[PDB]
Amino acid sequence: QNGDFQILDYTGLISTMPRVDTLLQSMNLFTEHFGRTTVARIERLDDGAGDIKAV
Amino acid sequence: QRGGVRQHLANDRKKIVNLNIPFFPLDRSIDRADIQNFREFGTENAPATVDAEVQ
Numbered sequence: 705q706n707g708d709f710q711i712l713d714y715t716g717l718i719s720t721m722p723r724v725d726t727l728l729q730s731m732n733l734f735t736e737h738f739g740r741t742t743v744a745r746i747e748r749l750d751d752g753a754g755d756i757k758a759v
Numbered sequence: 760q761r762g763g764v765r766q767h768l769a770n771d772r773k774k775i776v777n778l779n780i781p782f783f784p785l786d787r788s789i790d791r792a793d794i795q796n797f798r799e800f801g802t803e804n805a806p807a808t809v810d811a812e813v814q
Contacts (some may be wrong), residue, residue: 743793
């Protein structure tokens with residue numbers, strides 16, 4: 705800064721970035737579907753349970 | 760009468776005209792919303808294509 709007489713040499717650089725979470729992704733809990741329409745359908749089939757008896 | 764006065768002819772006639780011409784424009788536009796989620800209205804499930812609207 706005191707003029708061009710003092711030729712300056714290499715200088716380093718550092719940076720900071722915001723934190724990013726990876727817990728849920730690391731756990732592998734979510735699945736991805738690619739659609740066409742803006743609305744997504746969900747279809748939940750429910751089964752029925754029972755116990756057999758001797759005859 | 761013979762030997763006296765004579766008779767003379769008239770002259771011709773001319774006319775000139777000028778005219779202008781009108782103009783007829785026609786324009787239209789296409790937006791995303793017209794094909795975003797609208798079924799083609801042809802086959803059962805073919806999505807709407809811009810080409811069909813262009814035609």
